[PDB]
Ligand binder design. Structure first.
Ligand SMILES: CCCCCCCCC/C=C\CCCCCCC(=O)OC[C@@H](COP(=O)(O)OC[C@H](O)CO)OC(=O)CCCC/C=C/CCCCCCCCC
Ligand SMILES: Nc1ncnc2c1ncn2[C@@H]1O[C@H](COP(=O)(O)OP(=O)(O)NP(=O)(O)O)[C@@H](O)[C@H]1O
Ligand SMILES: Nc1ncnc2c1ncn2[C@@H]1O[C@H](COP(=O)(O)OP(=O)(O)NP(=O)(O)O)[C@@H](O)[C@H]1O
Ligand SMILES: [Mg+2]
Ligand SMILES: [Mg+2]
Lengths: 576, 571
């Protein structure tokens, strides 16, 4: 079932130019194997014409024979050069389509599955898959028809000259070969997959160490960092050496078998020539076939190995990138109301198992009102808003948005209705313009600059901020607060019903914090605002405060009614 | 360059490399006899065909088989040694890179992402591979086969054949070297665009959640599709030149060797040339393709893998200022900080620190505040030796920062960064980052002081597996990992850059209490917008647009300064 899907996926990556280049590669490889299977006869015809006659033969016929042999050799090499030219053209062709499909496949993945591995891993995963496709494209376009043509014609012709021992031992070899190799192909594929996986693990650890280099540098941790990479590389070498040995054994055994079987056919025809039983022409033909047969034998060996091993390694890739999907019913044409109310009913959640993060959160929130959510680090404020923001769908209980459940809301509509301002910032290495166009693609130069004022990012160090400001990796080109302001500026281009601010202002000064938080309520008057904070002034300003403790909502109501009643908020209101 | 590749080979590596060179050379000696054995077989065919002529034909046919067998055994043996050598050189290459990356400056490290550095290793490893190959295979072997050919064809006194043969190698080596550089430049430029593309993929994948939640598939996809289009165009430009060189080299071979074939045909038809010699000549024409091909590779591959490997050494061994350092410095337990007229720019375009003049002392806690963009982080980063391109001076008990080794500075100062850097590993590993030699107990002791010894009424295990960017943990729990690291370290200066923002008053005050307890003589710089730290400090410093605008006690500043007055009014 998955075998059919694999080849259909490779075929789909080929546009019209791609399909021609692939069939041209198959044709040229097939045509040249026809032509080169003629050449051992030409050689035999040259040999007899000369053998016996004492320079008494048609010199014009020898020239015609020698020219035909040359045509064979020239056309076969022209074919090799033409195949590799078409091969690289098809690699280039299929490359772009493959890479975009990956990015688009990664975008449609769930946050839980995305978080599982880093960039180093996903980057090298594409690498392996691309190469796996390449191998499969090659093995199909080159090692299917061509070795069959050359092996069929060889037994047909040697059978025609009524040499039974030669054609016999020849057919015996292809039989013993195809059996022996298939009986060891899977054993190689498993050893190769396990290696390639360890290789991913190693690239994963390199990107992890390089992304956190400053930390390792400042803690003078070269030894600790170096040793855990050195361990990964040692796991890589050992996995590679295990493949190497099996690969080397198969090659040595296949070589020894060829020497024993084809060596006998060579000795047999030598004795046949010495006892006048066999002609020299025929002896040269059998000699010519023994030599010619190596490349189709090689191309079969390759196909049996390469097709199975690249199909195994490519199977594993398609699995960890298209699998994780529960159901998701969604609504066909939903046009959400400008005013939305949130109703969380007996919400329960666990990230893993054994430990529950949200016990039975029951809340009811309404349009145009600001609410504060607080609790100790580990209560699950972020978790709760993440679930409201559709990060996770594996939850017990229900969440409504004006009668409509979250389960029946499309991820596109949900993201248009709600805007979550994350605890950590996500700044793209690009222009400031690009980082803001993330929020709204169709936004004009003015709409974007207007938004900079709202996020207090229109002027930095008495200088006007350019929309063409290049932003370094993780936006570390900008201050902690300036990073927060990028993410805040995004909100102003968006048009949501619910606005979640998860400690999204923590890096800002008292002036900026208040001005932006003011601009949010001004710009979005009907927006329901959930605010996560450990600070009394941010809790004070809200229409109602909710205290989360160990998964359950322990206290509700006005801040003043809570600053003495509740154990946590009294703990906050310890200062002053 | 070649010394760097050679250095990557241990004793087993050097054997495997020389075995590859030897076997490649030996097989080219053996296979260069081959056209003469074919000639002798053609000679015998036009003879008497006596018992002895038949026996001689067989012994001859066996020698040609030995040639063909030994040449193929050599191919199989070479590829076996090549993969063994790849495996061998692989580890040594990769660690040298990581160790080279560790010794790089923060400014240069920040320039490119992991996607880029990961694929940069990929390209260089492959460039080494190619070079190892072209040297071990395409130098002695084609020379042997080309020399013996002209020598033998010259011996049989065929001047036109040996003439046009020598003419071909001459026209070939000239034509190709004329186009090699043009190919290398087109290939390097392509490989660089390839890095740019991997860089954009890792940038997009690392910030996927952001792009997902902003329904930005179109903007994200478009950006990558543009990069891929820049990649294809750069690749197609190489492809065309590569394809043209190959077709022109093929057309030259057809014209030159085709003439040698027609000449010897006419020589055979006019009784001038024997059939035995005519075979030997076509046998030499056919044999010559592989050494011509290996020279075609050597010429083109050695140049293009040297160009792209030159670039890799340039960007990974340069941009070093000076650093005079100190031989054996054993820093005093008590250190005072003296910043005198400090000025700094990141990109010279704008000044970030105007003329910061400060003086700080042992066992005293100081607070630094100001608006976002004033330069609090910048200043402490310079104190922490992140940057060295600064005007003015910074002392540490008479000793200047400029004369302090980055290792000693990192032992004297401990900077708790604005953003957290959690390693995807065990909690144990994240804490062992601070001190390698730390025992299981020293590490658990530190978990208590960090307020991380219990999470959700459950005891925290040192074997807790931490996901990419530590997103397996809460904002505050992340901050606590970085804080726990400080307790394994032994510094004189402790900088806390908004390192407790994600913590509530209780824990913020509780951890900051255990810091002062465990590090009594430590000078503490605290960057905070909150007041529960500013009020706790022995002195407050207000930074505004690069210059230090206010000093003294917090209470004396919420009277004098409007910024400190307004900040305190948030009660
Ligand atoms: C003139 C000479 C030209 C060359 C000759 C070409 C012959 C090609 C032979 C290719 C495949 C044959 C099958 C290989 C498995 C045999 C090993 C064997 O014992 O296999 C037992 C199983 C099938 O093998 P498998 O599970 O895949 O694992 C292989 C492993 O060796 C289990 O232990 O079934 C049978 O016993 C039935 C076998 C018959 C199936 C098909 C026959 C078609 C005949 C040829 C037509 C196949 C189509 C391709 C070629 C036209
Ligand atoms: N991805 C994750 N996998 C497993 N557990 C997690 C994950 N993220 C968070 N947790 C745990 O769930 C608990 C609550 O996490 P979270 O919702 O981030 O917290 P919080 O209450 O908002 N804390 P804080 O923002 O730091 O003040 C913590 O004890 C975390 O360790
Ligand atoms: N790596 C960098 N490259 C270029 N400019 C930078 C860099 N880091 C900081 N800046 C700029 O320097 C100024 C101050 O940066 P920084 O020292 O982080 O700030 P801050 O005043 O401490 N702000 P904050 O901690 O976020 O509230 C800002 O205008 C930044 O854009
Ligand atoms: Mg949180
Ligand atoms: Mg800062």
């Amino acid at each position: 079932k998955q075998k059919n899907s694999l080849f259909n996926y490779i075929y789909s990556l080929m546009d019209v130019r791609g399909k021609f280049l692939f069939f041209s590669m198959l044709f040229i490889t097939s045509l040249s194997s026809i032509i080169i299977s003629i050449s051992p006869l030409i050689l035999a015809k040259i040999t007899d014409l000369l053998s016996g006659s004492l320079s008494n033969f048609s010199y014009e016929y020898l020239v015609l024979l020698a020219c035909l042999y040359m045509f064979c050799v020239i056309s076969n090499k022209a074919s090799v050069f033409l195949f590799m030219i078409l091969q690289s053209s098809l690699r280039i062709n299929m490359q772009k389509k493959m890479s975009l499909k990956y990015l688009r496949e990664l975008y449609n993945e769930n946050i839980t599955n995305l978080s599982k591995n880093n960039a180093g891993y996903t980057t090298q995963s594409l690498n392996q898959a691309s190469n796996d496709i390449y191998i499969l494209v090659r093995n199909v376009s080159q090692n299917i028809l061509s070795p069959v043509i050359q092996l069929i014609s060889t037994i047909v012709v040697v059978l025609s000259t009524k040499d039974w021992f030669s054609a016999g031992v020849f057919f015996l070899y292809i039989l013993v070969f195809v059996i022996f190799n298939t009986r060891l192909t899977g054993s190689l594929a498993s050893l190769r997959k396990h290696s390639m996986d360890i290789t991913l693990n190693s690239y994963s650890l390199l990107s992890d160490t390089v992304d956190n280099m400053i930390a390792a540098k400042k803690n003078n941790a070269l030894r600790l960092i170096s040793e855990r990479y050195e361990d990964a590389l040692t796991q890589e070498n050992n996995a590679q050496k295990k493949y190497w040995l099996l690969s080397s054994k198969v090659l040595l055994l296949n070589s020894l078998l060829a020497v024993i079987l084809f060596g006998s056919v060579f000795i047999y025809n030598i004795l046949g020539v010495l006892n006048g039983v066999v002609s020299i022409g025929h002896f040269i033909m059998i000699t010519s076939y023994i030599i010619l047969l190596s490349t189709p034998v090689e191309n079969i060996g390759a196909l049996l190995s390469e097709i199975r091993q690249s199909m195994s390694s490519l199977a594993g890739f398609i699995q960890r990138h298209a699998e994780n999907k529960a159901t998701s019913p969604s609504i066909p044409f939903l046009n959400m109301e400008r005013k939305l109310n949130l109703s969380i009913r007996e919400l329960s959640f666990s990230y893993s198992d054994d430990k529950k993060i949200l016990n039975s959160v029951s809340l009811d929130l309404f349009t145009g009102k600001m609410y504060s959510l607080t609790g100790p680090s580990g209560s699950g404020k972020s978790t709760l808003v993440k679930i409201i923001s559709g990060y996770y769908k594996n939850y017990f209980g229900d969440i409504y948005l004006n009668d409509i459940s979250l389960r029946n809301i499309s991820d596109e509509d949900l993201n248009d209705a709600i805007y979550y301002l994350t605890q950590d910032d996500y700044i793209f290495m690009d222009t400031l313009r690009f980082n803001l166009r993330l929020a709204n693609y169709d936004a004009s130069e003015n709409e974007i600059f207007k938004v900079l004022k709202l996020a207090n990012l229109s002027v930095v160090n008495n200088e006007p901020v350019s929309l063409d400001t290049h932003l370094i990796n993780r936006g570390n080109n900008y201050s902690g607060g300036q990073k927060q302001r990028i993410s805040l500026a995004r909100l102003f281009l968006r048009k949501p019903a619910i606005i979640i601010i998860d400690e999204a202002t923590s890096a800002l000064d008292y002036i900026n914090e208040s001005e932006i938080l003011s601009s949010i309520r001004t710009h979005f008057p009907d927006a329901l605002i959930i605010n996560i904070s450990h600070r009394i002034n941010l809790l004070e300003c809200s229409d109602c405060v909710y205290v989360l403790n160990e998964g359950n909502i322990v206290a509700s109501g006005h801040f003043r009614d809570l600053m003495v009643s509740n154990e946590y908020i009294s703990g906050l209101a310890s200062v002053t």
